[PDB]
Amino acid sequence: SVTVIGLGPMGKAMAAAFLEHGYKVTVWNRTSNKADELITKGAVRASTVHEALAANELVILSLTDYDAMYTILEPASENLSGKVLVNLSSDTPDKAREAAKWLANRGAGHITGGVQVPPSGISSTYYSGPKEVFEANKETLEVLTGTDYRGEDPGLAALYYQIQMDMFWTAMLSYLHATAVAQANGITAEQFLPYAAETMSSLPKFIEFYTPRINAGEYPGDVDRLAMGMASVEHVVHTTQDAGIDITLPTAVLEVFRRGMENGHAGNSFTSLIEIFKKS
Amino acid sequence: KSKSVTVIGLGPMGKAMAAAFLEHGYKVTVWNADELITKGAVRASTVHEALAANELVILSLTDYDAMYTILEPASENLSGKVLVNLSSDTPDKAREAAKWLANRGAGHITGGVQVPPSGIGKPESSTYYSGPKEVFEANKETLEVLTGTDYRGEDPGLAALYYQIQMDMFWTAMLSYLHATAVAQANGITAEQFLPYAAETMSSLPKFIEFYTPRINAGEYPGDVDRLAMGMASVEHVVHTTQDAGIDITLPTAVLEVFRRGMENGHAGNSFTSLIEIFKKSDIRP
Numbered sequence A: 001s002v003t004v005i006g007l008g009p010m011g012k013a014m015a016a017a018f019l020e021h022g023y024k025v026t027v028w029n030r031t032s033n034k035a036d037e038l039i040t041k042g043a044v045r046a047s048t049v050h051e052a053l054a055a056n057e058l059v060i061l062s063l064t065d066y067d068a069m070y071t072i073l074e075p076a077s078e079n080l081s082g083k084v085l086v087n088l089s090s091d092t093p094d095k096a097r098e099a100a101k102w103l104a105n106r107g108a109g110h111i112t113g114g115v116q117v118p119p120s121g122i123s124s125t126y127y128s129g130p131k132e133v134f135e136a137n138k139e140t141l142e143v144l145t146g147t148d149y150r151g152e153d154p155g156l157a158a159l160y161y162q163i164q165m166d167m168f169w170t171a172m173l174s175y176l177h178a179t180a181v182a183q184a185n186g187i188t189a190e191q192f193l194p195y196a197a198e199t200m201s202s203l204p205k206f207i208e209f210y211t212p213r214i215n216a217g218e219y220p221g222d223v224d225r226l227a228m229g230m231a232s233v234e235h236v237v238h239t240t241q242d243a244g245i246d247i248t249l250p251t252a253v254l255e256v257f258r259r260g261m262e263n264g265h266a267g268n269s270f271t272s273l274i275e276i277f278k279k280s
Numbered sequence B: 001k002s003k004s005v006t007v008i009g010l011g012p013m014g015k016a017m018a019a020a021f022l023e024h025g026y027k028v029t030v031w032n033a034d035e036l037i038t039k040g041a042v043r044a045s046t047v048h049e050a051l052a053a054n055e056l057v058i059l060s061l062t063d064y065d066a067m068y069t070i071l072e073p074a075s076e077n078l079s080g081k082v083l084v085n086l087s088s089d090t091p092d093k094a095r096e097a098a099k100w101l102a103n104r105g106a107g108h109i110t111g112g113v114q115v116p117p118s119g120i121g122k123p124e125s126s127t128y129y130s131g132p133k134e135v136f137e138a139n140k141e142t143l144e145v146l147t148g149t150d151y152r153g154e155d156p157g158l159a160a161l162y163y164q165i166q167m168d169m170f171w172t173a174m175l176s177y178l179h180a181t182a183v184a185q186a187n188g189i190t191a192e193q194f195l196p197y198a199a200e201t202m203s204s205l206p207k208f209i210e211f212y213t214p215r216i217n218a219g220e221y222p223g224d225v226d227r228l229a230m231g232m233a234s235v236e237h238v239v240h241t242t243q244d245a246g247i248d249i250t251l252p253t254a255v256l257e258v259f260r261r262g263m264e265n266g267h268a269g270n271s272f273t274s275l276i277e278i279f280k281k282s283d284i285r286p
Helices: A009-019 A036-041 A049-054 A066-073 A093-104 A131-136 A138-142 A156-184 A189-215 A226-242 A248-262 A270-277 B012-023 B034-038 B047-052 B064-074 B091-102 B133-143 B158-186 B191-217 B228-244 B250-264 B272-279
Strands: A002-005 A025-028 A043-045 A058-061 A084-088 A109-115 A124-128 A146-151 B004-008 B027-031 B056-059 B082-085 B107-113 B126-130 B148-153
Touching: A002 A009, A002 A049, A009 A025, A009 A036, A025 A036, A025 A049, A036 A043, A066 A093, A084 A093, A093 A109, A093 A156, A093 B228, A109 A131, A109 A156, A124 A156, A131 A138, A131 A146, A138 A146, A146 A156, A156 A189, A156 A226, A156 A248, A156 B158, A156 B191, A156 B228, A156 B250, A156 B272, A189 A270, A189 B158, A189 B191, A226 A248, A226 A270, A226 B091, A226 B158, A248 A270, A248 B158, A248 B250, A270 B158, B004 B012, B004 B047, B012 B027, B012 B034, B027 B047, B047 B064, B064 B091, B082 B091, B082 B133, B091 B107, B091 B158, B107 B133, B107 B158, B126 B133, B126 B158, B133 B148, B148 B158, B158 B191, B158 B228, B158 B250, B191 B272, B228 B250, B228 B272, B250 B272
Parallel strands: A002 A025, A002 A058, A025 A043, A058 A084, A084 A109, A124 A146, B004 B027, B004 B056, B056 B082, B082 B107, B126 B148
Antiparallel strands: A109 A124, B107 B126
16 A cells, blocks of 8 residues: 655654555665565565556655665656655755656656654654645655645755754754853753753744744844844854864854944844845 | 942943842942932942942943953952952953952952843843852842842853853854745745744754753764764755755855864764864864
């Protein structure tokens, strides 16, 4: 009743939750290792993708990256036709929409997925692509995680994933950076935890407060000043250097502030720096 | 020890502290503000009188350069005083100023204020305090007029430190939100549409921070739930998305540089949290 390709982390993590509900579940892996275990719970494992595709209409692609998709599926392109391929990736929007057209030109349906959680979260997922083909396999997808359809463009699901990861990676390194500064001044990562937690948990309040102003392209400085902002970032950079810690991350922050100041935003809200990000 | 206090520095923060003290029965002398006089404060015309008025002096200044400008010409009269510096400068400037004050005979306490002026006089609020234990305990009660107190230790720099590293995270994290929003908007998705996802992502960080804390704390970075190598590839995807949107790449490429130094140093198979050694220059010779 479903097929999983890419018996890696999420791969098995998905295949497990499928056999736990009663679908004829086939499987297959790139390196072509046997990965026996799940074969003992209702899983056929074909000797090529030719059959693993002709097994069911639904197919879930959990590959390392999109390049690997073309490699294994090109041999069987004559059988992609009439299938619905759910492509769960971590790649850029352009790669997703390149992939979707490739699959559409073989006669297949497609859904682009952006998984929001580690395989342990097998909880929401981004989905984009043709509306009708998503609604038709909605229930089946809701087994893996919650579904959050974002629209028609096959790249929307990748895009939403990527801007989450933008924030996650940058905020998490600032936490590692802040922890390096803390340790060099003699406070442990364990003592710092509640303070790093409150800061990160306080950010939604600021986002909710600024969003409507950002939405309107307005940056009044009634509650904060870019200038005070900048002075404050300068204190962070000097704190870091005095502690003997690498300064490249906070310096990158200071540079965005500096550009805002020189574009005349000193009296505006620091949120005006989004204009600097839009290369104004 | 009567209920009297001096507040030097009368910007939004000093005015609130002074009002909090007035409302709690202190005779309050000030120097920099018509409003606080109408409420019972006494203005000292000069720094010398301000300092002579009381043992306990509260400083709310822009930073420590401001402290020397106004305290230097009155170096005498600093003797048996207890100065509380409630300014937000670096730890090293707080250690310097503590030693400068003690050399003129003044006890000292550093504070880092975690709230806007209007959170002063609410028990919900806290302030970092650091410096010699006994002088802080002898003034604990008075300082709780303004906020709760979180004494952090002897090192006079610790209050400023805790403030600065929460700034480190706040500004870096907020800019990544602005950066992410720009990328969203450039792909036609509004900041209101993005809002829920931006808030969830920031909301879920305490969970990741809690998970990694005992490993980081023990200097251990095993690769059992994440790999640096996979992380750099994810950062790479982010930069490519950012540039396809026409959005400035400064912020995410700085992030990528850190991952690069980590890979270069043989940590491909460690957790990405081993990047904290990169930040400590463990790879750079001492």
